[PDB]
mmCIF file of C-alpha atoms in Angstrom:
data_model
loop_
_atom_site.group_PDB
_atom_site.id
_atom_site.type_symbol
_atom_site.label_atom_id
_atom_site.label_comp_id
_atom_site.label_asym_id
_atom_site.label_seq_id
_atom_site.Cartn_x
_atom_site.Cartn_y
_atom_site.Cartn_z
ATOM 1 C CA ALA A 1 -145.699 43.846 -84.724
ATOM 2 C CA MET A 2 -144.955 39.674 -85.229
ATOM 3 C CA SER A 3 -142.534 37.750 -87.590
ATOM 4 C CA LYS A 4 -143.789 34.165 -88.646
ATOM 5 C CA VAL A 5 -141.378 31.755 -89.804
ATOM 6 C CA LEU A 6 -141.899 28.878 -91.790
ATOM 7 C CA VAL A 7 -140.038 26.150 -91.344
ATOM 8 C CA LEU A 8 -139.221 22.794 -93.935
ATOM 9 C CA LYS A 9 -137.747 19.890 -93.329
ATOM 10 C CA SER A 10 -136.576 17.569 -96.564
ATOM 11 C CA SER A 11 -133.843 15.175 -94.973
ATOM 12 C CA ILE A 12 -135.305 11.501 -95.356
ATOM 13 C CA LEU A 13 -133.392 10.328 -91.810
ATOM 14 C CA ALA A 14 -136.010 12.261 -89.878
ATOM 15 C CA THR A 15 -134.777 12.482 -86.436
ATOM 16 C CA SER A 16 -131.717 11.145 -86.521
ATOM 17 C CA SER A 17 -130.502 14.366 -89.177
ATOM 18 C CA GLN A 18 -128.224 16.529 -88.405
ATOM 19 C CA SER A 19 -130.259 19.086 -90.758
ATOM 20 C CA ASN A 20 -133.040 18.113 -89.141
ATOM 21 C CA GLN A 21 -131.391 18.889 -85.637
ATOM 22 C CA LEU A 22 -129.993 22.369 -86.578
ATOM 23 C CA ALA A 23 -133.534 22.943 -87.426
ATOM 24 C CA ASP A 24 -135.359 21.213 -84.696
ATOM 25 C CA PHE A 25 -132.363 24.196 -81.995
ATOM 26 C CA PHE A 26 -133.340 26.413 -85.094
ATOM 27 C CA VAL A 27 -137.182 26.396 -83.535
ATOM 28 C CA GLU A 28 -136.029 26.308 -80.206
ATOM 29 C CA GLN A 29 -133.535 29.212 -80.355
ATOM 30 C CA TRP A 30 -136.447 31.298 -82.417
ATOM 31 C CA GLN A 31 -138.823 30.499 -79.784
ATOM 32 C CA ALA A 32 -136.567 31.705 -76.957
ATOM 33 C CA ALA A 33 -135.109 34.681 -78.432
ATOM 34 C CA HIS A 34 -138.693 36.027 -80.020
ATOM 35 C CA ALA A 35 -141.230 34.774 -77.955
ATOM 36 C CA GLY A 36 -144.232 36.863 -79.615
ATOM 37 C CA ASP A 37 -143.306 35.404 -83.269
ATOM 38 C CA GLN A 38 -145.201 32.490 -84.900
ATOM 39 C CA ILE A 39 -143.385 29.621 -85.594
ATOM 40 C CA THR A 40 -144.484 27.059 -88.364
ATOM 41 C CA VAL A 41 -142.886 23.566 -89.206
ATOM 42 C CA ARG A 42 -143.259 21.418 -92.334
ATOM 43 C CA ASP A 43 -141.664 18.291 -92.905
ATOM 44 C CA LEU A 44 -141.748 17.034 -96.221
ATOM 45 C CA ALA A 45 -140.326 13.899 -95.031
ATOM 46 C CA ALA A 46 -143.322 13.041 -93.320
ATOM 47 C CA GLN A 47 -146.002 14.457 -95.728
ATOM 48 C CA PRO A 48 -144.612 14.031 -98.548
ATOM 49 C CA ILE A 49 -145.402 16.611 -101.369
ATOM 50 C CA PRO A 50 -146.769 14.442 -105.014
ATOM 51 C CA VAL A 51 -144.095 14.298 -107.866
ATOM 52 C CA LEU A 52 -144.772 16.554 -111.047
ATOM 53 C CA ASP A 53 -145.995 14.625 -113.616
ATOM 54 C CA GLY A 54 -147.622 15.248 -116.434
ATOM 55 C CA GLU A 55 -150.721 15.178 -114.368
ATOM 56 C CA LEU A 56 -149.652 17.279 -112.113
ATOM 57 C CA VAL A 57 -148.504 19.501 -114.523
ATOM 58 C CA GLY A 58 -151.665 20.159 -116.447
ATOM 59 C CA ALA A 59 -153.161 20.954 -112.787
ATOM 60 C CA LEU A 60 -151.024 23.637 -112.359
ATOM 61 C CA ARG A 61 -151.878 24.642 -116.112
ATOM 62 C CA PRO A 62 -152.870 28.996 -115.681
ATOM 63 C CA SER A 63 -156.117 27.732 -117.771
ATOM 64 C CA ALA A 64 -161.194 20.852 -117.322
ATOM 65 C CA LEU A 65 -159.087 19.469 -114.043
ATOM 66 C CA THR A 66 -159.945 15.538 -112.652
ATOM 67 C CA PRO A 67 -160.757 15.000 -109.099
ATOM 68 C CA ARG A 68 -156.518 13.811 -108.356
ATOM 69 C CA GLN A 69 -155.525 17.546 -110.696
ATOM 70 C CA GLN A 70 -158.046 19.501 -107.789
ATOM 71 C CA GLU A 71 -156.516 17.785 -105.046
ATOM 72 C CA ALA A 72 -152.919 18.491 -107.233
ATOM 73 C CA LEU A 73 -153.379 21.727 -107.718
ATOM 74 C CA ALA A 74 -155.338 22.462 -104.371
ATOM 75 C CA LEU A 75 -152.236 21.586 -102.146
ATOM 76 C CA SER A 76 -149.961 23.899 -104.909
ATOM 77 C CA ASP A 77 -152.357 26.900 -103.177
ATOM 78 C CA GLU A 78 -151.786 25.576 -100.188
ATOM 79 C CA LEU A 79 -148.104 25.180 -99.845
ATOM 80 C CA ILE A 80 -148.183 28.949 -102.145
ATOM 81 C CA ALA A 81 -150.562 30.457 -99.505
ATOM 82 C CA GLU A 82 -148.111 29.321 -96.082
ATOM 83 C CA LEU A 83 -145.052 30.075 -98.227
ATOM 84 C CA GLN A 84 -146.492 34.116 -99.141
ATOM 85 C CA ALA A 85 -148.233 33.712 -95.295
ATOM 86 C CA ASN A 86 -144.625 34.425 -93.543
ATOM 87 C CA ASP A 87 -142.159 36.616 -93.371
ATOM 88 C CA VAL A 88 -138.445 34.542 -92.600
ATOM 89 C CA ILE A 89 -138.439 31.099 -95.055
ATOM 90 C CA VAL A 90 -136.013 28.818 -93.565
ATOM 91 C CA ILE A 91 -135.116 25.784 -95.366
ATOM 92 C CA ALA A 92 -133.613 22.581 -94.452
ATOM 93 C CA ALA A 93 -131.397 20.980 -97.492
ATOM 94 C CA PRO A 94 -128.875 18.736 -97.686
ATOM 95 C CA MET A 95 -127.224 17.397 -100.188
ATOM 96 C CA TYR A 96 -127.679 14.033 -101.215
ATOM 97 C CA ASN A 97 -125.916 12.541 -104.813
ATOM 98 C CA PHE A 98 -124.546 16.115 -105.739
ATOM 99 C CA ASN A 99 -128.574 17.552 -104.802
ATOM 100 C CA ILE A 100 -130.919 18.822 -102.828
ATOM 101 C CA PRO A 101 -133.852 15.869 -101.741
ATOM 102 C CA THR A 102 -136.366 15.129 -103.679
ATOM 103 C CA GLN A 103 -138.770 15.766 -100.747
ATOM 104 C CA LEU A 104 -137.784 19.657 -101.641
ATOM 105 C CA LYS A 105 -137.565 19.506 -105.045
ATOM 106 C CA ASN A 106 -141.230 18.172 -104.692
ATOM 107 C CA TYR A 107 -141.781 21.195 -102.815
ATOM 108 C CA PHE A 108 -140.331 23.559 -105.264
ATOM 109 C CA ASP A 109 -141.773 22.840 -108.644
ATOM 110 C CA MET A 110 -145.644 22.817 -106.605
ATOM 111 C CA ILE A 111 -145.012 26.454 -105.368
ATOM 112 C CA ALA A 112 -143.408 27.470 -108.746
ATOM 113 C CA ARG A 113 -146.285 28.780 -111.361
ATOM 114 C CA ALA A 114 -146.368 30.984 -113.996
ATOM 115 C CA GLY A 115 -149.471 33.988 -112.912
ATOM 116 C CA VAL A 116 -148.681 33.310 -109.279
ATOM 117 C CA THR A 117 -145.252 32.837 -107.724
ATOM 118 C CA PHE A 118 -143.532 34.708 -111.237
ATOM 119 C CA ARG A 119 -145.169 36.888 -113.630
ATOM 120 C CA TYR A 120 -143.635 37.970 -117.286
ATOM 121 C CA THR A 121 -143.131 41.578 -117.770
ATOM 122 C CA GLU A 122 -142.277 43.569 -120.955
ATOM 123 C CA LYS A 123 -138.801 43.823 -118.998
ATOM 124 C CA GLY A 124 -138.649 40.243 -118.303
ATOM 125 C CA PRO A 125 -139.827 37.652 -115.475
ATOM 126 C CA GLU A 126 -140.148 38.505 -111.886
ATOM 127 C CA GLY A 127 -140.944 37.264 -108.670
ATOM 128 C CA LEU A 128 -143.743 37.777 -106.528
ATOM 129 C CA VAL A 129 -143.366 35.990 -103.525
ATOM 130 C CA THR A 130 -141.499 39.224 -102.054
ATOM 131 C CA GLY A 131 -139.955 40.334 -99.322
ATOM 132 C CA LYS A 132 -138.722 37.386 -97.354
ATOM 133 C CA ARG A 133 -135.594 37.075 -95.672
ATOM 134 C CA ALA A 134 -134.205 33.509 -96.531
ATOM 135 C CA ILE A 135 -132.519 31.003 -94.534
ATOM 136 C CA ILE A 136 -130.672 28.219 -95.921
ATOM 137 C CA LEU A 137 -129.572 25.004 -93.318
ATOM 138 C CA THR A 138 -127.271 23.111 -96.488
ATOM 139 C CA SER A 139 -123.612 20.669 -96.332
ATOM 140 C CA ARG A 140 -120.274 21.834 -97.450
ATOM 141 C CA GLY A 141 -118.579 20.014 -100.064
ATOM 142 C CA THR A 142 -113.822 20.656 -109.310
ATOM 143 C CA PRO A 143 -117.009 22.159 -106.406
ATOM 144 C CA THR A 144 -119.336 20.081 -105.774
ATOM 145 C CA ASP A 145 -121.526 22.573 -104.087
ATOM 146 C CA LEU A 146 -123.684 23.351 -106.816
ATOM 147 C CA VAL A 147 -126.942 23.272 -104.498
ATOM 148 C CA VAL A 148 -126.229 26.988 -103.898
ATOM 149 C CA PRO A 149 -126.289 27.955 -106.783
ATOM 150 C CA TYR A 150 -128.966 26.069 -107.440
ATOM 151 C CA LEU A 151 -131.516 27.168 -104.736
ATOM 152 C CA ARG A 152 -130.327 31.339 -105.243
ATOM 153 C CA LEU A 153 -131.484 30.645 -109.115
ATOM 154 C CA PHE A 154 -134.596 29.108 -108.193
ATOM 155 C CA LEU A 155 -135.336 31.694 -105.104
ATOM 156 C CA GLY A 156 -134.359 34.913 -106.743
ATOM 157 C CA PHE A 157 -136.559 33.451 -109.569
ATOM 158 C CA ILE A 158 -139.687 33.443 -107.726
ATOM 159 C CA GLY A 159 -138.316 36.703 -105.846
ATOM 160 C CA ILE A 160 -136.619 35.817 -102.688
ATOM 161 C CA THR A 161 -133.901 37.748 -103.254
ATOM 162 C CA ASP A 162 -132.838 37.629 -98.950
ATOM 163 C CA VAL A 163 -130.350 34.915 -99.056
ATOM 164 C CA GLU A 164 -128.296 33.387 -96.418
ATOM 165 C CA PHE A 165 -126.366 30.098 -96.350
ATOM 166 C CA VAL A 166 -125.243 28.862 -93.203
ATOM 167 C CA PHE A 167 -123.559 25.690 -93.515
ATOM 168 C CA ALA A 168 -123.299 22.908 -91.074
ATOM 169 C CA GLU A 169 -120.173 19.845 -90.063
ATOM 170 C CA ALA A 170 -121.421 23.166 -81.619
ATOM 171 C CA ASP A 171 -120.041 25.531 -84.506
ATOM 172 C CA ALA A 172 -123.290 25.739 -86.381
ATOM 173 C CA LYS A 173 -125.718 25.962 -83.504
ATOM 174 C CA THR A 174 -123.152 29.182 -82.423
ATOM 175 C CA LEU A 175 -123.764 30.601 -86.221
ATOM 176 C CA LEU A 176 -127.343 29.786 -86.138
ATOM 177 C CA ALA A 177 -127.175 31.948 -82.660
ATOM 178 C CA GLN A 178 -126.225 34.494 -84.657
ATOM 179 C CA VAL A 179 -128.440 34.027 -87.196
ATOM 180 C CA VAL A 180 -131.172 34.325 -85.057
ATOM 181 C CA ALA A 181 -129.545 37.273 -82.823
ATOM 182 C CA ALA A 182 -129.151 39.498 -85.517
ATOM 183 C CA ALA B 1 -125.340 -6.967 -130.924
ATOM 184 C CA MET B 2 -122.351 -4.785 -131.882
ATOM 185 C CA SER B 3 -122.982 -2.123 -129.335
ATOM 186 C CA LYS B 4 -125.346 -2.255 -127.200
ATOM 187 C CA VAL B 5 -127.522 1.156 -126.111
ATOM 188 C CA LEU B 6 -129.745 2.235 -123.305
ATOM 189 C CA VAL B 7 -131.512 5.461 -123.701
ATOM 190 C CA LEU B 8 -133.467 6.638 -120.802
ATOM 191 C CA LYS B 9 -136.389 8.780 -121.187
ATOM 192 C CA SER B 10 -137.895 11.241 -118.554
ATOM 193 C CA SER B 11 -140.192 14.411 -119.855
ATOM 194 C CA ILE B 12 -143.289 14.415 -118.257
ATOM 195 C CA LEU B 13 -144.979 16.406 -121.141
ATOM 196 C CA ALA B 14 -144.864 12.419 -123.389
ATOM 197 C CA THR B 15 -145.894 12.651 -127.476
ATOM 198 C CA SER B 16 -145.006 16.690 -127.407
ATOM 199 C CA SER B 17 -142.284 16.344 -125.310
ATOM 200 C CA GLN B 18 -138.960 17.405 -127.509
ATOM 201 C CA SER B 19 -137.469 15.778 -124.849
ATOM 202 C CA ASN B 20 -139.050 12.392 -125.728
ATOM 203 C CA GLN B 21 -139.311 13.127 -130.280
ATOM 204 C CA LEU B 22 -135.838 13.465 -129.693
ATOM 205 C CA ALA B 23 -135.434 10.793 -128.518
ATOM 206 C CA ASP B 24 -137.250 8.375 -130.470
ATOM 207 C CA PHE B 25 -135.885 9.755 -133.364
ATOM 208 C CA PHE B 26 -132.120 9.037 -131.957
ATOM 209 C CA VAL B 27 -133.558 5.353 -131.340
ATOM 210 C CA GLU B 28 -134.514 4.452 -135.543
ATOM 211 C CA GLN B 29 -131.527 7.062 -136.392
ATOM 212 C CA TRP B 30 -129.133 5.062 -133.897
ATOM 213 C CA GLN B 31 -130.345 1.548 -135.440
ATOM 214 C CA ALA B 32 -130.965 2.878 -139.343
ATOM 215 C CA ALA B 33 -127.272 4.020 -138.684
ATOM 216 C CA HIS B 34 -126.237 0.703 -136.614
ATOM 217 C CA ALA B 35 -129.006 -2.304 -138.263
ATOM 218 C CA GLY B 36 -127.090 -5.024 -135.748
ATOM 219 C CA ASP B 37 -126.486 -2.647 -132.379
ATOM 220 C CA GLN B 38 -129.710 -3.896 -129.987
ATOM 221 C CA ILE B 39 -131.510 -0.809 -128.272
ATOM 222 C CA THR B 40 -132.920 -0.586 -124.175
ATOM 223 C CA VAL B 41 -135.519 1.769 -124.245
ATOM 224 C CA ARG B 42 -136.648 2.679 -120.110
ATOM 225 C CA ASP B 43 -138.982 5.262 -119.749
ATOM 226 C CA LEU B 44 -138.823 6.648 -116.605
ATOM 227 C CA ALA B 45 -142.114 8.889 -116.655
ATOM 228 C CA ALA B 46 -144.314 6.060 -118.333
ATOM 229 C CA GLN B 47 -143.382 3.318 -115.089
ATOM 230 C CA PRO B 48 -141.720 5.669 -112.904
ATOM 231 C CA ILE B 49 -139.215 4.530 -110.245
ATOM 232 C CA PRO B 50 -140.410 5.225 -106.240
ATOM 233 C CA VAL B 51 -138.961 8.305 -104.127
ATOM 234 C CA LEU B 52 -136.282 7.317 -101.739
ATOM 235 C CA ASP B 53 -138.084 7.503 -98.479
ATOM 236 C CA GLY B 54 -136.229 6.699 -95.368
ATOM 237 C CA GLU B 55 -137.920 3.427 -95.137
ATOM 238 C CA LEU B 56 -136.296 2.904 -98.960
ATOM 239 C CA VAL B 57 -133.138 4.066 -97.909
ATOM 240 C CA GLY B 58 -131.938 1.154 -95.436
ATOM 241 C CA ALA B 59 -132.599 -1.564 -98.330
ATOM 242 C CA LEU B 60 -130.125 0.500 -100.146
ATOM 243 C CA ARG B 61 -126.908 -0.735 -97.590
ATOM 244 C CA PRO B 62 -125.916 -3.559 -95.468
ATOM 245 C CA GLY B 63 -128.581 -6.122 -90.572
ATOM 246 C CA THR B 64 -131.893 -6.196 -89.685
ATOM 247 C CA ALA B 65 -135.042 -6.939 -90.950
ATOM 248 C CA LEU B 66 -135.840 -5.904 -94.311
ATOM 249 C CA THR B 67 -139.863 -4.802 -95.329
ATOM 250 C CA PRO B 68 -141.277 -6.359 -98.572
ATOM 251 C CA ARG B 69 -141.507 -2.461 -99.578
ATOM 252 C CA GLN B 70 -136.948 -2.272 -98.574
ATOM 253 C CA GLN B 71 -137.174 -5.709 -100.506
ATOM 254 C CA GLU B 72 -139.113 -4.487 -104.532
ATOM 255 C CA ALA B 73 -136.889 -1.255 -103.359
ATOM 256 C CA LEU B 74 -133.794 -2.924 -103.562
ATOM 257 C CA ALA B 75 -134.157 -5.657 -105.926
ATOM 258 C CA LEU B 76 -135.177 -2.376 -108.336
ATOM 259 C CA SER B 77 -132.327 -1.236 -107.671
ATOM 260 C CA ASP B 78 -130.515 -4.205 -108.390
ATOM 261 C CA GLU B 79 -132.565 -4.597 -112.234
ATOM 262 C CA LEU B 80 -131.648 -0.890 -113.158
ATOM 263 C CA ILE B 81 -128.077 -1.692 -112.086
ATOM 264 C CA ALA B 82 -127.453 -4.579 -114.020
ATOM 265 C CA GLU B 83 -129.253 -3.425 -117.295
ATOM 266 C CA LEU B 84 -127.030 -0.089 -116.699
ATOM 267 C CA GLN B 85 -123.942 -2.519 -116.960
ATOM 268 C CA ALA B 86 -125.290 -4.829 -118.886
ATOM 269 C CA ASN B 87 -125.124 -1.681 -122.280
ATOM 270 C CA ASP B 88 -122.006 0.103 -123.725
ATOM 271 C CA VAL B 89 -123.775 3.704 -124.686
ATOM 272 C CA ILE B 90 -125.406 5.575 -122.188
ATOM 273 C CA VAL B 91 -128.215 8.193 -123.502
ATOM 274 C CA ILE B 92 -130.336 9.852 -120.809
ATOM 275 C CA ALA B 93 -132.763 12.704 -121.726
ATOM 276 C CA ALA B 94 -133.098 15.441 -119.722
ATOM 277 C CA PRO B 95 -134.815 18.321 -119.835
ATOM 278 C CA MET B 96 -134.074 21.060 -117.499
ATOM 279 C CA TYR B 97 -137.270 21.246 -115.092
ATOM 280 C CA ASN B 98 -137.146 24.655 -112.658
ATOM 281 C CA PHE B 99 -133.413 24.804 -113.339
ATOM 282 C CA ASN B 100 -132.988 21.228 -112.158
ATOM 283 C CA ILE B 101 -133.463 17.424 -113.843
ATOM 284 C CA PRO B 102 -136.677 16.235 -113.936
ATOM 285 C CA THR B 103 -137.415 13.935 -110.735
ATOM 286 C CA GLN B 104 -138.063 10.883 -112.606
ATOM 287 C CA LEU B 105 -134.519 10.698 -113.898
ATOM 288 C CA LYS B 106 -133.599 12.011 -110.282
ATOM 289 C CA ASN B 107 -135.477 8.885 -109.053
ATOM 290 C CA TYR B 108 -133.361 6.402 -110.813
ATOM 291 C CA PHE B 109 -130.009 8.465 -109.973
ATOM 292 C CA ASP B 110 -131.056 7.849 -106.309
ATOM 293 C CA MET B 111 -131.355 3.853 -106.919
ATOM 294 C CA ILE B 112 -128.229 3.620 -108.618
ATOM 295 C CA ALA B 113 -125.794 5.624 -106.467
ATOM 296 C CA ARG B 114 -124.916 2.650 -103.865
ATOM 297 C CA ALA B 115 -122.015 2.251 -102.153
ATOM 298 C CA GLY B 116 -119.997 -0.441 -103.392
ATOM 299 C CA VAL B 117 -121.941 -1.477 -105.915
ATOM 300 C CA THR B 118 -121.363 1.265 -108.195
ATOM 301 C CA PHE B 119 -118.526 2.863 -106.610
ATOM 302 C CA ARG B 120 -115.946 1.965 -103.681
ATOM 303 C CA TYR B 121 -113.664 3.926 -101.412
ATOM 304 C CA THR B 122 -110.424 3.423 -102.290
ATOM 305 C CA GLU B 123 -106.678 4.157 -99.668
ATOM 306 C CA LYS B 124 -106.498 7.375 -102.775
ATOM 307 C CA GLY B 125 -110.248 8.189 -102.256
ATOM 308 C CA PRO B 126 -113.733 7.032 -104.591
ATOM 309 C CA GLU B 127 -114.032 5.884 -107.470
ATOM 310 C CA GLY B 128 -116.789 4.505 -109.571
ATOM 311 C CA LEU B 129 -117.704 1.723 -110.922
ATOM 312 C CA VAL B 130 -120.339 1.998 -114.009
ATOM 313 C CA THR B 131 -116.986 1.527 -116.221
ATOM 314 C CA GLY B 132 -116.169 1.987 -120.066
ATOM 315 C CA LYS B 133 -119.310 4.096 -120.653
ATOM 316 C CA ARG B 134 -119.692 6.086 -123.341
ATOM 317 C CA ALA B 135 -122.684 9.017 -122.446
ATOM 318 C CA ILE B 136 -124.878 11.139 -123.994
ATOM 319 C CA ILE B 137 -127.319 14.026 -122.772
ATOM 320 C CA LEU B 138 -129.823 15.023 -124.221
ATOM 321 C CA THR B 139 -130.531 18.281 -122.434
ATOM 322 C CA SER B 140 -132.232 21.991 -122.878
ATOM 323 C CA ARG B 141 -129.994 24.814 -123.075
ATOM 324 C CA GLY B 142 -130.359 28.320 -121.074
ATOM 325 C CA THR B 143 -126.086 35.132 -113.429
ATOM 326 C CA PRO B 144 -126.066 31.181 -113.583
ATOM 327 C CA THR B 145 -127.845 29.654 -116.020
ATOM 328 C CA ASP B 146 -127.898 25.782 -116.852
ATOM 329 C CA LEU B 147 -126.008 23.556 -113.152
ATOM 330 C CA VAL B 148 -127.560 20.497 -114.838
ATOM 331 C CA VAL B 149 -124.765 20.183 -117.231
ATOM 332 C CA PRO B 150 -121.744 20.208 -114.135
ATOM 333 C CA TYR B 151 -124.658 18.645 -111.978
ATOM 334 C CA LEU B 152 -124.593 15.746 -114.560
ATOM 335 C CA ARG B 153 -120.844 15.687 -115.448
ATOM 336 C CA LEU B 154 -120.573 15.140 -111.574
ATOM 337 C CA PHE B 155 -122.379 12.570 -110.442
ATOM 338 C CA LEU B 156 -121.992 10.340 -113.615
ATOM 339 C CA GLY B 157 -118.470 10.860 -113.332
ATOM 340 C CA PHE B 158 -118.567 10.286 -109.737
ATOM 341 C CA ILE B 159 -120.049 6.159 -110.937
ATOM 342 C CA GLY B 160 -117.316 6.404 -113.249
ATOM 343 C CA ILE B 161 -118.728 7.615 -116.463
ATOM 344 C CA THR B 162 -115.964 9.546 -117.484
ATOM 345 C CA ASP B 163 -117.085 9.850 -121.426
ATOM 346 C CA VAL B 164 -119.818 12.182 -121.701
ATOM 347 C CA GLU B 165 -120.905 14.416 -124.851
ATOM 348 C CA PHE B 166 -123.961 16.789 -123.817
ATOM 349 C CA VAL B 167 -126.836 17.640 -126.897
ATOM 350 C CA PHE B 168 -128.319 20.398 -126.371
ATOM 351 C CA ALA B 169 -132.111 21.438 -128.408
ATOM 352 C CA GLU B 170 -135.075 22.655 -127.922
ATOM 353 C CA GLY B 171 -137.538 20.357 -130.284
ATOM 354 C CA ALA B 172 -133.929 20.347 -137.902
ATOM 355 C CA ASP B 173 -131.057 21.913 -136.606
ATOM 356 C CA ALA B 174 -131.303 19.555 -133.366
ATOM 357 C CA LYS B 175 -131.688 16.518 -135.448
ATOM 358 C CA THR B 176 -128.810 17.130 -137.671
ATOM 359 C CA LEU B 177 -126.481 17.085 -134.441
ATOM 360 C CA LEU B 178 -127.841 13.986 -133.135
ATOM 361 C CA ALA B 179 -128.217 12.928 -136.583
ATOM 362 C CA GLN B 180 -123.038 13.657 -136.268
ATOM 363 C CA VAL B 181 -123.738 11.782 -132.720
ATOM 364 C CA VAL B 182 -124.951 9.027 -134.066
ATOM 365 C CA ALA B 183 -122.482 8.753 -136.635
ATOM 366 C CA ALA B 184 -119.932 9.592 -134.454
#
């Protein structure tokens, strides 16, 4: 009866990032609290995700595929399988020029595929990544905090409805301890 | 010469993209209406901008030795900022890809947003430095729906582009509204 937690780091400042510091503290805290849980950490900056281009869009089509497109498609299936395998989804999404980091944006463009991560129904589109609890490490800032509706909308589209946002500005680590203890 | 126009294409669907079809129709319409105007068209998909890395993020700020990649990134940044300042009308084609702008346009934005170059800090607060520009946005139209409109308004306003006009399309009507924008 273990839980699998996926942690997604996207900051480009590496160990210098406050978001990555809070993500690592989150890993240590969850490992201490639930010694049996299995934690997977993917760094989207250290190992980047390719940019969504026309050839990538061709590779991710529901329907001939070049070697490049086969590699890209294989990577997309890897990310989707890893995402569906984990019960808790921790996403570190700091704000770069009023948007999420490009790395995480590539991740999103590679995990959003019709018929795999969502489907069309007579009642409308519905997501297929079900039963996930998502926690978002983000910053807090005519509002400029448009990242929250974007992440809630995107994640909800692929079926991740249960999304909690924790904002960072000591106090943030007490909040993350409350999240891990919940 | 009367107006220098900058057109930024960002769609990844190439000839089939409604964004690029309406962008080309906009260029042909503008040079048809103002035969003296000079139009520069940059295609962010044909010639992509590199993604902002932790290495490149150090080139766009004031100390140590710059790596060749960082020199290339800084040079390209100054080229984009200079080209942006040189034009008076800024036409941006920003279709919606999974509730966000295309990554090509986003990399362009991350390369033109530089402290002390396109925006400065004041006693009153931050202020943009790309002044006297008329921007027009070619975008799509959809709980929450279009998040790209307040995002583009916010970022463009931050670097000083306050006069921003949004044109929503999908692929007849769209060409009529674009013709009205050109004639406006």
